[PDB]
Amino acid sequence: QIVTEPFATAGVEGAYDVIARIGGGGVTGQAGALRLGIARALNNVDPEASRPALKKAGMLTRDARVKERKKAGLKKARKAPQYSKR
Amino acid sequence: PRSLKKGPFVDEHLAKKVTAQNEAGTHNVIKTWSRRSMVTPDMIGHTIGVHDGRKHVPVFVTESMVGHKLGEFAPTRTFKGHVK
Amino acid sequence: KIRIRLRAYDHEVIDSSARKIVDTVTRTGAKVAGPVPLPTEKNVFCVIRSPHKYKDSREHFEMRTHKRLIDILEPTPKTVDSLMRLDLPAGVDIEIKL
Amino acid sequence: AKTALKVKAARKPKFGVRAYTRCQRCGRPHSVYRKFGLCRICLREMAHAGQLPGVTKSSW
Amino acid sequence: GQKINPHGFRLGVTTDHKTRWYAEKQYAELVGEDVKIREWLHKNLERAGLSSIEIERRSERVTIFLYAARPGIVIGRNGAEAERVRGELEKLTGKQIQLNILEVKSPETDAQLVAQGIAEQLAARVAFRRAMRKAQQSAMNAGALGIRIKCSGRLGGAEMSRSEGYREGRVPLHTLRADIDYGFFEARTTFGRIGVKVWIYKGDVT
Amino acid sequence: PRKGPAPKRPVMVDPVYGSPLVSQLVSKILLDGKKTVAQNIVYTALEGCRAKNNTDPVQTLKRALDNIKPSLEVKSRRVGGATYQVPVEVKPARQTTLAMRWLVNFSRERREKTMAERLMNEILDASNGLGASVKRREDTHKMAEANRAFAHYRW
RNA sequence: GGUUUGACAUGGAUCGGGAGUGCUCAGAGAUGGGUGUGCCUCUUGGUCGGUUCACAGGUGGUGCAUGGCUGUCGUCAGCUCGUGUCGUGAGAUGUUGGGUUAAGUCCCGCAACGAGCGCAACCCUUGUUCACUGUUGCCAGCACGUUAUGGUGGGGACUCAGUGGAGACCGCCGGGGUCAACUCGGAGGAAGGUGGGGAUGACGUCAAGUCAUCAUGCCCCUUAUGUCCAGGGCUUCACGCAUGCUACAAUGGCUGGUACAGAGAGUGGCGAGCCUGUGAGGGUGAGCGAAUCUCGGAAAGCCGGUCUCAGUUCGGAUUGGGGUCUGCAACUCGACCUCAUGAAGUCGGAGUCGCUAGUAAUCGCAGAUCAGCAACGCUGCGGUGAAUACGUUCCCGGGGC
Ligand SMILES: CON(C)Cc1ccc(O)c2c1C[C@H]1C[C@H]3[C@H](N(C)C)C(O)=C(C(N)=O)C(=O)[C@@]3(O)C(O)=C1C2=O
Ligand SMILES: [Mg+2]
Ligand SMILES: [Mg+2]
Numbered sequence A: 001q002i003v004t005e006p007f008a009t010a011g012v013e014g015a016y017d018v019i020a021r022i023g024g025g026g027v028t029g030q031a032g033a034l035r036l037g038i039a040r041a042l043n044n045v046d047p048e049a050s051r052p053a054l055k056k057a058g059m060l061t062r063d064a065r066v067k068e069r070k071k072a073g074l075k076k077a078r079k080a081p082q083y084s085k086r
Numbered sequence B: 001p002r003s004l005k006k007g008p009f010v011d012e013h014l015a016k017k018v019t020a021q022n023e024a025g026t027h028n029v030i031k032t033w034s035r036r037s038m039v040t041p042d043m044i045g046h047t048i049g050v051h052d053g054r055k056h057v058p059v060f061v062t063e064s065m066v067g068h069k070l071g072e073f074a075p076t077r078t079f080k081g082h083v084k
Numbered sequence C: 001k002i003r004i005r006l007r008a009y010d011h012e013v014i015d016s017s018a019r020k021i022v023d024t025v026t027r028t029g030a031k032v033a034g035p036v037p038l039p040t041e042k043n044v045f046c047v048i049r050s051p052h053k054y055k056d057s058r059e060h061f062e063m064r065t066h067k068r069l070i071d072i073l074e075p076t077p078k079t080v081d082s083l084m085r086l087d088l089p090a091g092v093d094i095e096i097k098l
Numbered sequence D: 001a002k003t004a005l006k007v008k009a010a011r012k013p014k015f016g017v018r019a020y021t022r023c024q025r026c027g028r029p030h031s032v033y034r035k036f037g038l039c040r041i042c043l044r045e046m047a048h049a050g051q052l053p054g055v056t057k058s059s060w
Numbered sequence E: 001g002q003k004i005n006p007h008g009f010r011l012g013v014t015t016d017h018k019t020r021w022y023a024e025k026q027y028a029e030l031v032g033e034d035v036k037i038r039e040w041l042h043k044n045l046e047r048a049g050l051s052s053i054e055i056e057r058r059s060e061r062v063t064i065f066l067y068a069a070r071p072g073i074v075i076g077r078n079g080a081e082a083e084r085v086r087g088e089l090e091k092l093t094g095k096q097i098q099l100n101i102l103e104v105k106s107p108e109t110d111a112q113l114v115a116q117g118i119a120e121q122l123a124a125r126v127a128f129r130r131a132m133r134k135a136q137q138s139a140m141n142a143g144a145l146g147i148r149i150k151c152s153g154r155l156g157g158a159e160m161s162r163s164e165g166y167r168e169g170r171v172p173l174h175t176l177r178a179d180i181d182y183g184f185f186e187a188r189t190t191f192g193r194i195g196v197k198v199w200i201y202k203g204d205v206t
Numbered sequence F: 001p002r003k004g005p006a007p008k009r010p011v012m013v014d015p016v017y018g019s020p021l022v023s024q025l026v027s028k029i030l031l032d033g034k035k036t037v038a039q040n041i042v043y044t045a046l047e048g049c050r051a052k053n054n055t056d057p058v059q060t061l062k063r064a065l066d067n068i069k070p071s072l073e074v075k076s077r078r079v080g081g082a083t084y085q086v087p088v089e090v091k092p093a094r095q096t097t098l099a100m101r102w103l104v105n106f107s108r109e110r111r112e113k114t115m116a117e118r119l120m121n122e123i124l125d126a127s128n129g130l131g132a133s134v135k136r137r138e139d140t141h142k143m144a145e146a147n148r149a150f151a152h153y154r155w
Numbered sequence G: 001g002g003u004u005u006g007a008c009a010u011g012g013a014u015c016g017g018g019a020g021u022g023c024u025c026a027g028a029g030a031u032g033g034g035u036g037u038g039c040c041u042c043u044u045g046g047u048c049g050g051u052u053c054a055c056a057g058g059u060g061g062u063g064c065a066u067g068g069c070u071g072u073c074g075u076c077a078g079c080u081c082g083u084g085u086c087g088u089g090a091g092a093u094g095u096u097g098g099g100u101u102a103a104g105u106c107c108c109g110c111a112a113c114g115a116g117c118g119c120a121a122c123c124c125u126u127g128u129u130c131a132c133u134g135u136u137g138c139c140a141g142c143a144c145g146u147u148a149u150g151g152u153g154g155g156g157a158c159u160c161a162g163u164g165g166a167g168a169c170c171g172c173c174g175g176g177g178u179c180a181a182c183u184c185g186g187a188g189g190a191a192g193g194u195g196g197g198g199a200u201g202a203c204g205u206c207a208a209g210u211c212a213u214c215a216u217g218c219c220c221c222u223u224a225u226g227u228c229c230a231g232g233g234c235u236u237c238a239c240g241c242a243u244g245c246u247a248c249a250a251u252g253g254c255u256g257g258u259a260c261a262g263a264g265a266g267u268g269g270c271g272a273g274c275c276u277g278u279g280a281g282g283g284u285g286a287g288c289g290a291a292u293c294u295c296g297g298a299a300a301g302c303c304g305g306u307c308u309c310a311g312u313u314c315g316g317a318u319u320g321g322g323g324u325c326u327g328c329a330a331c332u333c334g335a336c337c338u339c340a341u342g343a344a345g346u347c348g349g350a351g352u353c354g355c356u357a358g359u360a361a362u363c364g365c366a367g368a369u370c371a372g373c374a375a376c377g378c379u380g381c382g383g384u385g386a387a388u389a390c391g392u393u394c395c396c397g398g399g400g401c
C-alpha cells in the first residue's frame, strides 16, 4: 500500500507502468524509498495538478529518521546499563 | 585433547629417564616437573615424582594410568573444607 | 594506461598533489583522466580516557586515508621522466603502475 | 614497566608463542595497538599532541 | 581534571600535525623512531628551549625542524653542535637526517617557551606570583589577546599542593576557530615538580 | 512532562480493512517488533470472526471495543495520611487504548492453544457481552461507583 | 633451583682479539661443558671481555608530599572581575525586579556602567540539492558477448564514491506580545522555530582514583624487596552481592525453499574453487596490500511441511565416549566438532532498573586485543520496530529569588 498509494493520491491510477531499481536497507525502508521516488517522479512530471495534493499528503518529504548511533557507556543508542545503587 | 596425528607428547627427558630405568632396572623414583607429559606403556610400573607446585608427589604408574597426563595425579590446590 | 595512486591523510594536500600531477603531465601534452576519488579508509580507535578504573568515559580517534586515482592515457616517455623526477609533499605518497 | 621485563620482551623469546607486545614508548603490557605500537595512554596523549599523522578525534 | 588538550581539540580544524609522513607497513616502527628522536632532543637540548619538533619523511630520509627560541646552543660554534647532534641522530635512527633549526618570532608569545621560562624560574626558586605576573605582562606587551597561566604543586616548597592561576584578556577554550596555543612544562624542584600550563589566545583564524 | 503535551504520532489505517482500529490492534499486539507476525495474527482472528458470524469483522471488533470501553476509572490520591481512589472520567482516546490493552492482555491470558484465535474467541465473547475483558470493565466501573464519593477532588 | 657492576643503561681506566653464534653434551630450565667459525681500520678506531671503579635495578612505601591524566556534582546555568557607588567593616550593587528562553538566552526597567570564563555559534556526522571528476563504482540510449557475468567498446543520464558550493535565518505572511524579546498559526521547502546525533564539561567540590601507564619529593631493599628459570597460582568454594547470557515455549521448536543490509578487516593475513570427512577440519589452492579479491552466510521475515500444550520434538545445564585445531605444551586451565546423557526452569518474594522515536523491544553483522580463547564482555553497524506522556500532587536530583 505504501508504494501503490502515490498513484491513488495522484490523478493517475494503476494504468501507468513503473520500473524500479532498489538497493540497500530492509524491506520496509526499500518500500519507503520507492514510495518517495514515485512521489518525486509524479511531482516532476506534473508539478501543478499533482503537486498540491501529493505534498499535502506528506509524500514529497524524506524523513531523516535513521538509526541513532551507539554511545560509550550505554548498551544501545539510548538504553543504559542497569543502575545499581549499593 | 592433543591431535592424534601429532602423537602423544612425552617431554623428551622423562622419556629418556624412563628408558634408562628400563635398561638398568625398573627400580627407582624418577623426579620430574613434567606435569605436561603423557603417560605411556613404556613407563608402566614405574614411580614418578610429579611436581605439584611445591613438592614432588610420587605416583606409582599402573596399567590404567596410560590415557592420562602426569599432572592429573598431582593435585595443586589443597582445600580440606571451609571452616573445620 | 599508466596508473597513479595517491594516498595521504589530508584531502587538501591530496587535491593539491593531484592538481600538480595533472597540470605537469598536461604541460607535457599527455591527456589524462581526471582525478577520481576512491573511498576513504576509516580506521577507528576507542580508548579509555582515564589511566585507571574509569571505563564509561572514552575517547574515539580516526585515521582517515584519502586516495585518488589518475590515468595517464598518453604514454609520453617525457611525461614518464617528469613523473618520476618531480617532488611531492612528504605527507602524500605516490604509486606508479606502468 | 620494569626495565628487566622491557628488555626480556624486546629479546627473541625461547618459543615463538611466548612473545608479547609491550608499549614501545611506555612499556605497558596491556592495551597495545598493533597499528602503531604504543598503548592506551600513550596513544591518547600522543594523538592529542599531534605526533601521530592521520590520527584525529572522531565525533561522527 | 576534566579539560581537553586545546591542541588535540583543534587538531585538523585549525592546528596541524607535527609529523607528516605516510606509511602502512612500518607505521609502528616509524612512530618508535620518532619517539626516540623527540625524547633524545628534549633530553639533550633543554638549554636551547624547544617550541616544537616537526618530523617529515620522504623515502628512508628524515627531516627534523627544530623550533627553538635560542638556536645558539643548537648550532654551537660554526655549526659544530649542529653537526654533532645530526651525527647522534644518524647513530640513533640509522637514516639520513636533514636537520634545520628555526627561530620563534615571539618567544614571549609562544606558550611552550613561556612555560619553559616559568618552570625555569620556579626551579631557580623565584616567587611564583612574581613569575606568573611577569610572564603575563610580557605576553600582553607582545600583543596576545589573552593569557592564562596555572601552576600546580607544592608551590613555594610547602606541604599542601596548590593550583594558583593568573589570567586576563580573553581565552575562549570552547571556541574551535579560536587560535589558542597551549604549552606545558614541569619545574623540577627539591620538592617534587610543579606543573605549569599556559594558554595564549593568539587571535581568531578561519 | 513539565514542558507540555507531547505531540501524538498519527495513526495509520489498515490497508485491508481500511480502519485505524485494526492498525491500533496490530500495533498493540506487536510483540518483539514483529509487525508481520502481529498482523498475521490479527488478520487470522478477523477472518475467523467473519467465519463464525456473517457480520463484518471490523464491525464486530468495534462492537467488542465499545463493550470493553470504560467510562470512568479511579486513580490513587495522596490527600492526607491515607490514599484515596478518586474516580476520573476517561477521554475517548484513553478509553479506546484501555479497551485495546485489556482485549490483547486477556486474549493472551485465554486458555486456548494459539494466539490468533484466542484473540478471535475473546473478540467474539466481548462483542456478545461476555469474557474477562468485559468482566474487568464492569469491575472497574463498579469500583468507581463504590468510590464515587470523591468526584469533588477532580482538578 | 640459579645469579651478584648484576637481566638492562652511561662513563673512566686495565688486559685483549673476536664478539656473536652453528652442532653436541649435562640439566626441569636457568646455566654450565664441548666442537666448528672466527673483527674492520691501523700501530692508534668500531666491538667485547673481565677486574674493579663509579654505578645500575625495585609493579618496594606514602595518591593525605606531588605533576600528569580521569571520575564526579553536571550539559547542571552558573561562576567571577575592572571601575563606580553604598556601608566603619566583612560585604553589597552589577548578577535584584517584570517578560521570555533549552540557556546569566534575550527584552524592559534599574547606581550601575563594562568585561571574562560558561550558554550559543565556529568543527564532525546525518537529512535536500548543484557543479567537478568516472575506477576498482554506476548502466539510461548504442554495438556484441558461449547460453550466460557492465564481460565488452562506450556513456555523464541515474546511483554511489569525495572535493568545493547552495540551503534555515522566526527570513516571509497573519495574530498575540505597551511595544520588545519572544510566542502562536500559515506558506514555501528535503528540513521550521535548536531538524537528529557526536565532539566540546565554566569557577570549583569530594585530601574522590591512579606512586601499578608514565614522571617524581622523601623513606626503605642492595649475595636481595635486584635479576634469571621450571613448576604452581592469579581459574580454589559451606557461601553473599553485582552485571550479563540462555531460558521457561505455540507471536514457539524442528525442517525444506526463498528475499532485503550497513559498517568494517586482510600478506606469518583474508582465502574462493575443487577433492575428502557426519562435522570441527584436512589436502590442494587461485585471487587480493585490496570500491577490484576474500571474510560473505546477513539473521529476524516470507512460503511449504511438521510438532499439538506434554516439564514437551520446550530448555541445554551436567556427565560418559570418540575427535579437530592452535601452540614447545591444552592435567591443573583453551575453543570447537560429534555420539550419548537431558538437570533446574511453569514467568520469578520484599524490592528494583532502562527507555519519550527510528527510541524501547528484538534480529543478526563487524572490529580492537589476539597463536588460540573461556567474548554471553566492550566499542560500532544496519534490519524489524512499538506503547505512552492528562499532568506536577507525591518520590529523587538540581536552578532563580
Ligand atoms: C584512613 O586514613 N585516615 C583515617 C584518613 C585518610 C588519610 C589518608 C588518605 O589517603 C585517606 C584517608 C581516608 C580515606 C577514606 C576513604 C574511604 N574509601 C576508601 C571508601 C571513603 O569512605 C571515602 C569516600 N566514600 O569518599 C574517601 O574519601 C576515601 O576514599 C579516602 O580518600 C581516603 C584516603 O585515601
Ligand atoms: Mg557503578
Ligand atoms: Mg600472547
Ligand SMILES: [Mg+2]
Binding pocket: G063, G207
Ligand atoms: Mg587525591
Ligand SMILES: [Mg+2]
Binding pocket: none
Ligand atoms: Mg587507594
Ligand SMILES: [Mg+2]
Binding pocket: E174, G200
Ligand atoms: Mg557548546
Ligand SMILES: [Mg+2]
Binding pocket: none
Ligand atoms: Mg583517598
Ligand SMILES: [Mg+2]
Binding pocket: G211
Ligand atoms: Mg617507586
Ligand SMILES: [Mg+2]
Binding pocket: G234
Ligand atoms: Mg581473576
Ligand SMILES: [Mg+2]
Binding pocket: G289
Ligand atoms: Mg589495508
Ligand SMILES: [Mg+2]
Binding pocket: G356
Ligand atoms: Mg528525553
Ligand SMILES: [Zn+2]
Binding pocket: D023, D025, D026, D027, D028, D038, D039, D040, D041, D042, G213
Ligand atoms: Zn604506554
